[PDB]
Amino acid sequence: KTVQVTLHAVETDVAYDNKGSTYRAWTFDGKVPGPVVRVTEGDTVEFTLINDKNSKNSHSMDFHAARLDVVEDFESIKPGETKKYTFTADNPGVFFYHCGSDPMIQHIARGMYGVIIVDPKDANALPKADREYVLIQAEHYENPDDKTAMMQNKWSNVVFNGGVFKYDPVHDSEATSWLQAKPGERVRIYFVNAGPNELSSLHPIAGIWDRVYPSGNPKNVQYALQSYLIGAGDAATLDLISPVEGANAIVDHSMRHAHSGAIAVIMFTNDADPEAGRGENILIR
Amino acid sequence: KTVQVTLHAVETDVAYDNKGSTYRAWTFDGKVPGPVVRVTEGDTVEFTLINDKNSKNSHSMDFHAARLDVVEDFESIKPGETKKYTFTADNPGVFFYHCGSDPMIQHIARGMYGVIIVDPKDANALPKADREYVLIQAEHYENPDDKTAMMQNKWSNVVFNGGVFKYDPVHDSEATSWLQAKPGERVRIYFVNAGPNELSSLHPIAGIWDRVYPSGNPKNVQYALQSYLIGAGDAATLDLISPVEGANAIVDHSMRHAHSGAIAVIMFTNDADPEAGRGENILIR
Amino acid sequence: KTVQVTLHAVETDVAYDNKGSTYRAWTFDGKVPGPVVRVTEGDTVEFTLINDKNSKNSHSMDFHAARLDVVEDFESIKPGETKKYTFTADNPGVFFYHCGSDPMIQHIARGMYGVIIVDPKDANALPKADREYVLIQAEHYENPDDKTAMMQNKWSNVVFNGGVFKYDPVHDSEATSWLQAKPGERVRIYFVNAGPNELSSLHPIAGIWDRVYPSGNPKNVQYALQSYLIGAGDAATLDLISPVEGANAIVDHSMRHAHSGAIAVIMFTNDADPEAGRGENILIR
Numbered sequence A, B, C: 001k002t003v004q005v006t007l008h009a010v011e012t013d014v015a016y017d018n019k020g021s022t023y024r025a026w027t028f029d030g031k032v033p034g035p036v037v038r039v040t041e042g043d044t045v046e047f048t049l050i051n052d053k054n055s056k057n058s059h060s061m062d063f064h065a066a067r068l069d070v071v072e073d074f075e076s077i078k079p080g081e082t083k084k085y086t087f088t089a090d091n092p093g094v095f096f097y098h099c100g101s102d103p104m105i106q107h108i109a110r111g112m113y114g115v116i117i118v119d120p121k122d123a124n125a126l127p128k129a130d131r132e133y134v135l136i137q138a139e140h141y142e143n144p145d146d147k148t149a150m151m152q153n154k155w156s157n158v159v160f161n162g163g164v165f166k167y168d169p170v171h172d173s174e175a176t177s178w179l180q181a182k183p184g185e186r187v188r189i190y191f192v193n194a195g196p197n198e199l200s201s202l203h204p205i206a207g208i209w210d211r212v213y214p215s216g217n218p219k220n221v222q223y224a225l226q227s228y229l230i231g232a233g234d235a236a237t238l239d240l241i242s243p244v245e246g247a248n249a250i251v252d253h254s255m256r257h258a259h260s261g262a263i264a265v266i267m268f269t270n271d272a273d274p275e276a277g278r279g280e281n282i283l284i285r
């Protein structure tokens, strides 16, 4: 099928922690991360980018699910301009998308990143998930204008979905979000490491990855991994099943990253919200 | 089968180099790394942690081989307290274990780490090994109380099994340990990267990894790798066979790590000690 | 078959950017990277190293394709000396070679590195490539004599084949080289991360890796990867096919690396040079 996707490059204030501290973000659609894009393998994506008239910078769009021309297709457009391009999603899995404007380190760091999920055309290629969650790791830099600090990898926090300990109510009493599932259910994590710079060594504390799929591709399946290494600009699908009620903590096991905000708690309970990890709730905002 | 495993959280002085320099370590059973734990896939482990009465800190236990509740099972216990929990080793391979107390970065860095080996139930899943060796990489931090330096990744050394160049008699004439095998023998390395922060790019100088198993699982086999990337908090099983007498040097190929202590020499000779890499000698102390 | 390979350890000035800035390099055969060595699986390599009489340092040779003795075979030789050793290339793929002299961090960083390609004995193990290109990543350090800066990972640039933005005429107007292919052709990238310290997260902007082979081995094939992580001292074979005319940009997706020089443009055109990526032109100098 043919799907139409329109995103707006918007420069606006967004929250980055649980106390409501704000940041001068650059975004797709006024939020960090950008909207989840979801298509089926083989679908035609008609993409439109609108750079908001109030933006002070040129912006662009790069989909890792696209096979196109970097020069013409991923070109930067000025505030007030609109760009269109079309691509087929040739490969199933999970893919990073981000602004490709100069310099990419800053456009990514300021929040212009998201995920495109490409469901396999074969519905039985992956085992059936009972829950799905999107987690996108990124480094947070204190001064969004300081490109030197970014080049030197001097981040202040490492976060999931734009927030320091956004999903950790165990550590942070001010955290208001967490992942939910029932014991025995297959929880599918769509993970993207946006970077811009750092690696992620993703581990579920008190659990194990049942299956891991590099780039989300069913052909690359690995089994029963305690940890999985996701480079900057890479993505994977990771399945998790708890045999008991309680919690796991999804962490970047590079402890300095974890202690800086990269911990997401999943609660396994018999009374899990039936709407959690389903429909529009896969990226918890 | 059901086995019983008791470990003691002990805060004590241990040596970290070949000239007998000491460190105020936090340990399992007064040694770094902790005792090797070894079970068969499917086994029930009845675990007991005793926090020594002389400890000044709360401690805990996290097994990557366990599927439990992070909140209740991996909880911290005070000096003088005893905690018990039970888990089944559901998956074969090699798994990181460590203290999960606040902050994990420091508890790991000070020496509270080890390995649990889970032998496959199918005795023919892995090719028969003639030697087995445990190698655990960690960063050594000069001041064990300086949590800031740990957060900033300012380590002094990168070590195998708690010692700077512990297994490198070629470079350090004061080194008294090395790995042993005969030419043609299959040497199985159980490798754990304890971190807390850094990645390991493991390479046998003058050799090649015959086979590598991510998380030690037979299902994930990769062949003839010159190097293998092990993230912080990850583990793998790596097989090595030398066709000749001589030496290989197992290194973290990120050279700054290798030069800071991450080199382990394996000697291939016809007169190799029949006790080496067998029974109780797999982690050479 | 038996092949004879002679390399000279030569200390000489080489260019490292597009304005002809020079560096006091340590090299094999007066160039960075060293000459491409290419053999067939099972071949016998009779290797000779000649340390140039005017060298001020001892040098050596370490092939990741060799299974030998680090002590005797990879030993350092003085200026004016000649060393010989023989090895069989037992495993097919792509392998790092470098000087193994003290300290390796500096010998690698100053330019003593290259690639050995070992073609599979089974000519149908890999799909047929229409183009082949060698790309070797390394960190460039401003002061070649400053070993502390190297140990602290304080590089100035991250480069492909010894040059800052060597293959990026889109960004740098002074760049005179780029990769070439026609749409629909299978482009095979032989990639080596020489380091000495850093990891590479390799991604083709506006493309996807059709196939990736860890250590270039056909047995380890992975499919449709947006990115692939190559540790320091590791190598991989990565296949790329563009369905359209235009360009892809091969980048280390850790953005601070890319912005510091790690970007190589491949141009897909109907009028691509029939000599490009073939015969003697696989490593573009």
Ligand SMILES: [Cu+2]
Binding pocket: A009, A026, A058, A059, A060, A099, A100, A101, A107, A112
């Ligand atoms: Cu932008």
Ligand SMILES: [Cu+2]
Binding pocket: A062, A064, A096, A098, A233, C203, C253
């Ligand atoms: Cu990207």
Ligand SMILES: [Cu+2]
Binding pocket: B026, B058, B059, B060, B099, B100, B101, B107, B112
């Ligand atoms: Cu502890």
Ligand SMILES: [Cu+2]
Binding pocket: A203, A253, B062, B064, B096, B098, B233
């Ligand atoms: Cu852990």
Ligand SMILES: [Cu+2]
Binding pocket: C009, C026, C058, C059, C060, C099, C100, C101, C107, C112
């Ligand atoms: Cu040298």
Ligand SMILES: [Cu+2]
Binding pocket: B203, B253, C062, C064, C096, C098, C233
């Ligand atoms: Cu090497």
